[PDB]
Design a protein around this ligand. Structure first.
Ligand SMILES: *[C@@H]1O[C@H](CO)[C@@H](O[C@@H]2O[C@H](CO)[C@@H](O[C@@H]3O[C@H](CO)[C@@H](O)[C@H](O)[C@@H]3O)[C@H](O)[C@H]2NC(C)=O)[C@H](O)[C@H]1NC(C)=O
Ligand SMILES: *[C@@H]1O[C@H](CO)[C@@H](O[C@@H]2O[C@H](CO)[C@@H](O[C@@H]3O[C@H](CO)[C@@H](O)[C@H](O)[C@@H]3O)[C@H](O)[C@H]2NC(C)=O)[C@H](O)[C@H]1NC(C)=O
Ligand SMILES: *[C@@H]1O[C@H](CO)[C@@H](O[C@@H]2O[C@H](CO)[C@@H](O[C@@H]3O[C@H](CO)[C@@H](O)[C@H](O)[C@@H]3O)[C@H](O)[C@H]2NC(C)=O)[C@H](O)[C@H]1NC(C)=O
Ligand SMILES: CN1CCC[C@H]1c1cccnc1
Lengths: 383, 384, 383, 387, 382
């Protein structure tokens, strides 16, 4: 038919290595446009972004043209991309893999010579991340495009519009896109001379705080609440060590999980890490204090002797501040001895009871300190 | 060699170009009949919201160049030209999540003397889907597959559906999902006159066997175990182990559930909301257990009992809680009198100690009912 | 020129041998394709993925007619090796591959005689899909199959037959984990549709239990045997709750181990997985009854009272069932009488206290038989 | 261009489907030699060894030859490997992927027809593992090479030297290679009729224990020796089961880890997987004694009666061999006092029986301590005798 | 027909550019290739697998002679861009690839000048293998190399040479975990072998410890400091065994974390790892001593007897060394005397029990100083 003859005549003599300009000193205008389909994965520990895109190269040729008044008015044609000249546009900041994109999809010509190539692509780019406010953060990730061989005197890129097309976008459950603007730059390198043009598209995203405000923040708050209780347990219960050590182990496990969840960047200190370190230090301090009150509780006049300054401070001034507030001779000799034994026992018991009250005052002093500092530290540091 | 000559004529002598639409007129659409056949269902992973399946896509169009006069060459009626020698409509999936934008393997084509062509290539797809995890054991899903041509538009392609259902004859039965329906729809938007596609809405209902004996019964067992602490005596010394163990078990269960299903900011599973309630109640139980342990150990030499405490916890509260409240002679006289007075003082102190212990017991009993009623009140919106 | 060189040219160029046309002469002619599969190495069997890896050899051997010559014109040559991708091949491939590998392995040489009887023996490693049954987990027996079917042709064109009804074990390296019982092979043809012929080889493999019956069975039994000791503790050691919960945690560990080698199941579970659940339920009931016994133990007449029912039914009747047998002188007299009366009342109260200690022991002993009888009865039901 | 003319003349009429032999019914000699570059890893769970090699083929030809004088003194060319006949040497005992080696490196023609081919290759072979002594073990894995279709009367395989060429080896960190010998055999398979030749290269790697001793064996000894400490704790302390439970849980975790680091072969029993089973068995038997000795400590004269067979055994005979040898108005006042004295006497009489019960429990604990020490000292010299 | 068309025809047409012949006017001429590496982005360094990923730009610039023309007949064009699939290449590839692929993909254009110069700068992402030293894990500086050698050629044919002694980094996007110190390069040729020429670049990178110094070390220091509190708890509390076992598990948690970052070690154990084993050994010794102390505390005259030497060495000598210090009337008389004698006996045995308790308390304090002094000497060593 006429289509076969047109195809044969058009592609009988074609040099696919020559620039499609007719004058050697003239740039070949190339339009560029990016359309996104989905946002598949945003890796944090590895700092890698993966997306599926629809690149759109449209330019103009000079020798693949014809008039639709001879061949029955045919105004369009489709030819595989392997037999035509196509500009080389590559991703500068590729993280893994190669740089070749496509070439299976056939280009669309016209009677003017305009090609409308539109190949699919999948890219894995690199993106540094800031983990200052980890649960509630905004990330800025960008893609860099440009020609790898031709400079501004052969191929000059032109941007279509200013935003990535979002007509066919599958919404991500975790991340939400805010802005997707793009801009053109003219950069000059130090390895080689001449100026080179590039087009960069920047994606602005914001996380949705539901997964990490439920599985991480809530149990952390529960554990940080549980630590103050050890100063209300009596010393006779014998279960303070269990509680405090359980709290410590829970915090250690949380530390490990958080370490293996967020990336290891050494620029700024994340808020969660600071709060967890502060809470762990305060929990470690509480265990040290607990041993001392137990040691004070189990003290007797046989072993330890009470000083004066202890009696001067405790039981006297500190509790007021914390608003705590014949045969007859032998019978006498037998009955008496018994009474003297009872008197000595009473004195020993009184002295023992004095030591028990000191352990109660010390625990009350450290109850107010922890509640005063912990409530202000959590409110202030965590904003 | 008659068949070999017949193959030669229709591919070289007639110059069957592979890049020309088999259309005679300027507006003759190529009518494509599509029929999807199911083979098996593999994975419906809800962590990344993808589905894997294996299908055969049956397509059938018509050509006018692929016709030969039967009984003229040898009498042959069917050929087996390979796929990459005849114009193809390029029907692909437009929602895959891996970049797989084509079929798996290009099989051989079957062409008859009538001009009809039948193609059945096997394809493996990893489609994207939305998972509604709110009744996680008893959940019904709906995932769709979109088929479109990435080369031609409704001005030269007229995809139509053969039957309003998917073919399931070689379908190997699934082990953890049940099919309920498989409709097929063709959508044309009046605003856009160049948009044609077909969609096969998969509908699958879960079978709650694995996640109803190994996931729910242990959870309710632990929740029923969480109440036992209010019944232990305060002298045993094992009151602060049970509560902590229960809390750590519930936390582990919550973590495992969040690993199985990723609760996002669109819907929380009804099993993921009950564990929060249980953990909060267990924490309050820990706090009140600390309070009751502190109340139990209270000697009259360190604390003083106010009259309001007596009148509120020994005369009023136990009624509603259905509790019950169950020469040398002068010197000898002096010594025995001292002993008697010491014994009397000891008896008074012991009585005060018993009063404090009973007050702690009464406080312990009251919170048994409060936690039992709040459990019933809570488990009507967080589970119904 | 060499004899083989001349033979190859005059065979593959003068006649223009095209490897697309079936070698059949009649239109409705079937070409028999004899098969013989020889095992070489049973690599591995996967439980969670339900895929089996093997090393096998195929021996497809049809009888072409166009590849014939005389053993005198072309020297004394009678066997001539030819590359595989130069002669028509019936595409026989594995039809139940784990993934989309519906292809073949590398292409070695063909063996063509003067009679035309082609012989193809390609090496290949197959990863097929087979169903796994884990009822008797350490002593199970699996039946995994291999289905071979045509890729392009169908019946009335090919007639796949079996040369021998047994897969030979030539060049077999014995395994150390899985045994082998038999390797039957059967030919399946659909009576209704006369276009479906296939050959399937069934693998019957039996496990060799010595690594699991030492590392999972014995430790599980040992841990399960610790669930009874809770009822022999004296109830006065303050350690009646550190044992049952620990046993529960150990059983949780052992159950975790099992839930990894077992695929996600919806139709059958291993008998060990049913034993562990029974043991865990028994342990939970043990926790409940231990709490009740501990509550019963700590009682006194100043807080509780003993009803006649329990007094006469837990101290006389039930213990026998379990074989468990059990004027200055005026003032002086007044004071001494007071002391004696106080001693008498204290003794009476202590004696009443000791009654509440015996009922706890009787209740604990009663639940020893209940949990021992149920566990023994439950074990019989499983096996 | 002289080289272009030589290249055109050599490959004007040539096909790679024909053997390079001149006269029919003659074997073409092929010299084969491998060389190792880096041993990536030696998997034990799957019993797979991955290695990087450099195969070398040196065979002959008759039609690829020319006279140097006729040209500009050229005695060496470089032709692509996809244009000449090459023998098909494959790895028989493959484990994954394909069998054919990766060949793209250009050959090296000489003026007398001496082709040389040295293509890189990556192999993942499968060898059985011996876990009789999991540490300090010596593995023995082999690689088999042979022609798939050419028999012994055609390809006539030969070998150079007797050892794998190790000159560019990048040394590993966990394994040490001590022998890389290779030998040639002839086999006659059942499916075939003629004899077929092979060349097998076997490695003799040796493990370097630094990771699986300080992190596997050493921490286990502390747990193994911490089981006996329970019998020295006093019964009145109130922590006699925490130690036992902790030891049992630690042993369970250790068993789980060693199980999930070892292949599931069931031909031989490892000398650590049975030692840890024995340790777990005797740890379980230790908890039973503790419960049965905590029960004899709290018995009272008003709940249990001590039989004479216990008094004459656990109180007088056994302690000797354990070096723990046994260590109006006046009338009423009199009436009242006598009552007090009798009460005190009864209290003393009950306390004596309670003390006797405590001593019996102590004796039982000491006996079991001695038995467990004696057995556990023997144990190590046996299950862990020759590791 | 433009001018580039006639240029490319006369270059890769009837003159028959062979594409597989080494450019050499004579039989002994050596082609000299000048190399220069430009680092662009240090992606990651993996200690567990010992694989480093980089994004580099390697420039190769040899000199051909068949690609030359007079820039007067063909208009005024003197620079062309020919694809890298129809021109001879030296085939210089990485010789220490981690996966083991000595192959590259060629799709980028060349730049051929008028006088024969050829410039090739192909993009590439490399995954090399390098030795990782972990003696000081938080504060370590590594030394990983890149080795470039020819594949299809050897010496006496090529003359691989260096253009700049260093590797210019004038495209770097700074990392967040590693700091670049210097990037020198050297050319090694073995005189004992006339067929060996090499060019290699080595990277010296110093870590930036802020994340690990906060998520480790400090918690380990706190947990280690917690290990000395057991020797101060009273024996009557009955939680000594609870305290000891919990500290060991917490130290076990940290050891697992550290051992999952460093690779399987052979002879260079990290300094933060040897500390933890020492602490664990000390904690086990503490457990044994605590068991012994608990046994000593619970003693009574009815079951144990105090030897005369115990009351002389453990009571009056050691405590001074550790700075510590401490008609019917006959019947009535008989009964009251019996009561008095019973009370005296009770007091005597109670005093003996108190002496046993004080002996245990003295024993406990002795190991507090031994633990303190043996701990500091261990830290001084490593
Ligand atoms: C052009 O010729 C072909 C055959 O050369 C005819 O198409 C169909 O050919 C067979 C001949 O019996 C029939 O196929 C039918 O397919 C349905 C699918 O569900 C099946 O249920 C039937 O049992 C049968 O196998 C069918 O009779 C015939 N189609 C029609 C519409 O008659 C037909 O003559 C021509 N094809 C077209 C598309 O025009
Ligand atoms: C064409 O001529 C050959 C010349 O011998 C005829 O012999 C058959 O050739 C086959 C090869 O395809 C050989 O099969 C052999 O079978 C034995 C016994 O199972 C086995 O041990 C051998 O390894 C081999 O597989 C054998 O030489 C012979 N077949 C038999 C059954 O004796 C061949 O039959 C002729 N073909 C026709 C179509 O006439
Ligand atoms: C296992 O290690 C041993 C040595 O480390 C090797 O196995 C045996 O090695 C000897 C060589 O010392 C082989 O003997 C050789 O046999 C040829 C056969 O023609 C004969 O000429 C000589 O007697 C020669 O010494 C022996 O066959 C071989 N046996 C086996 C079963 O391998 C080898 O390195 C390793 N083998 C395996 C399978 O891992
Ligand atoms: C020599 N090979 C070893 C395995 C099969 C055998 C063989 C024989 C004939 C044709 N191909 C392969």
């Amino acid at each position: 038919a006429t289509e076969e003859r047109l195809f044969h005549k058009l592609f009988s003599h074609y040099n696919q290595f020559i620039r499609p300009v007719e004058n050697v000193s003239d740039p070949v205008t190339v339009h560029f446009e990016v359309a996104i389909t989905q946002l598949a994965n945003v890796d944090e520990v590895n700092q890698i972004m993966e997306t599926n895109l629809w690149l759109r190269h449209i330019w103009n040729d000079y020798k693949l043209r014809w008039d639709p008044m001879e061949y029955d008015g045919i105004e369009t044609l489709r030819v595989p991309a392997d037999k035509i000249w196509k500009p080389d546009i590559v991703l500068y900041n590729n993280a893994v893999g190669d740089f070749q994109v496509e070439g299976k999809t056939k280009a669309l010509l016209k009677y003017n010579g305009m090609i409308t190539w539109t190949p699919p692509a999948i890219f894995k780019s690199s993106c540094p991340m800031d983990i200052t406010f980890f649960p509630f953060d905004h990330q800025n990730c960008s893609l860099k495009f440009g020609s790898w061989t031709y400079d501004k005197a052969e191929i000059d890129l032109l941007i279509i519009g200013s935003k990535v097309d979002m007509n066919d976008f599958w919404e991500n459950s975790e991340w939400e896109i805010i802005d997707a603007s793009g801009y053109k730059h003219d950069i000059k390198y130090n390895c080689c001379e001449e100026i080179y043009t590039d087009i960069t598209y920047s994606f602005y995203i914001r996380r949705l705080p539901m997964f990490y405000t439920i599985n991480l923040i809530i149990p952390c708050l529960f554990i940080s609440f549980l630590t103050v209780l050890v100063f209300y347990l009596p010393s006779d219960c014998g279960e303070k060590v269990t509680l405090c050590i359980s709290v410590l182990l829970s915090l250690t496990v949380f530390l490990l999980v958080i370490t293996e969840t967020i990336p290891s960047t050494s620029l700024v200190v994340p808020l969660v890490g600071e709060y967890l370190l502060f809470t762990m230090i305060f929990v470690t301090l509480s265990i040290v204090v607990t041993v001392f009150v137990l040691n004070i509780h189990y003290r007797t006049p046989t072993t330890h002797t009470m000083p004066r300054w202890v009696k001067t401070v405790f039981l006297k001034l500190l509790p007021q501040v914390l608003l705590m507030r014949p045969e007859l001779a032998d019978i006498l000799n037998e009955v008496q001895y018994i009474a003297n034994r009872f008197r000595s026992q009473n004195e020993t018991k009184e002295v023992e009871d004095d030591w028990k009250y000191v352990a109660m005052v010390v625990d009350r002093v450290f109850l107010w300190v922890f509640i005063i500092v912990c409530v202000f530290g959590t409110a202030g540091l965590f904003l | 060699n008659a068949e070999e000559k017949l193959m030669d004529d229709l591919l070289n002598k007639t110059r069957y170009n592979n890049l020309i639409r088999p259309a005679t007129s300027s507006s003759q659409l190529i009518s494509i009949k599509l029929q999807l056949s199911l083979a098996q269902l593999i994975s419906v992973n809800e962590r990344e919201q993808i589905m894997t399946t294996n299908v055969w896509l049956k397509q059938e169009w018509t050509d006018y160049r692929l016709t030969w006069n039967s009984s003229r060459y040898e009498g042959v009626n069917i050929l087996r030209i390979p796929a990459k020698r005849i114009w193809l409509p390029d029907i692909v999936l437009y929602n895959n999540a891996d970049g797989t934008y084509e079929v798996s393997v290009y099989t051989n084509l079957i062409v008859r003397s009538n001009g009809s062509v039948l193609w059945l290539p096997p394809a493996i797809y990893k489609s994207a889907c939305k998972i509604e995890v709110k009744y996680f054991p008893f959940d019904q899903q709906n995932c769709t597959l979109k088929f479109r041509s990435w080369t031609y538009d409704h001005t030269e392609i007229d995809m139509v559906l053969m039957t309003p259902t998917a073919s399931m004859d070689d379908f190997t039965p699934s082990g953890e999902w049940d099919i309920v329906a498989l409709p097929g729809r063709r959508t044309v938007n009046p605003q856009d006159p160049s948009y044609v596609d077909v969609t096969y809405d998969f509908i699958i209902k879960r079978k709650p066997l694995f996640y109803t004996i190994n996931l729910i019964i242990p959870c309710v067992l632990t929740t029923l175990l969480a109440i036992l602490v209010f019944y232990l005596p305060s002298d045993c010394g094992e009151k602060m182990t049970l509560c902590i163990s229960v809390l750590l078990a519930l936390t582990f269960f919550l973590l495992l559930i969040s690993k199985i299903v990723p609760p996002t900011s669109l819907d929380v599973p009804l099993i993921g909301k009950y564990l929060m309630f249980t953990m909060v109640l267990v924490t309050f139980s820990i706090v009140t257990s600390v309070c009751v342990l502190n109340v139990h150990h209270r000697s009259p030499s360190t604390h003083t009992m106010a009259p309001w405490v007596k009148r509120c916890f020994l005369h009023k509260l136990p009624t509603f809680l259905f509790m019950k409240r169950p020469p040398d002679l002068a010197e000898i006289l002096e010594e025995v009198s001292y002993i008697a007075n010491r014994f009397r003082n000891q008896d008074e102190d012991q009585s005060v100690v018993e009063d404090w212990k009973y007050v702690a017991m009464v406080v312990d009993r009251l919170f048994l009912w409060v936690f039992m009623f709040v459990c019933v009140l809570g488990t009507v919106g967080l589970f119904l």
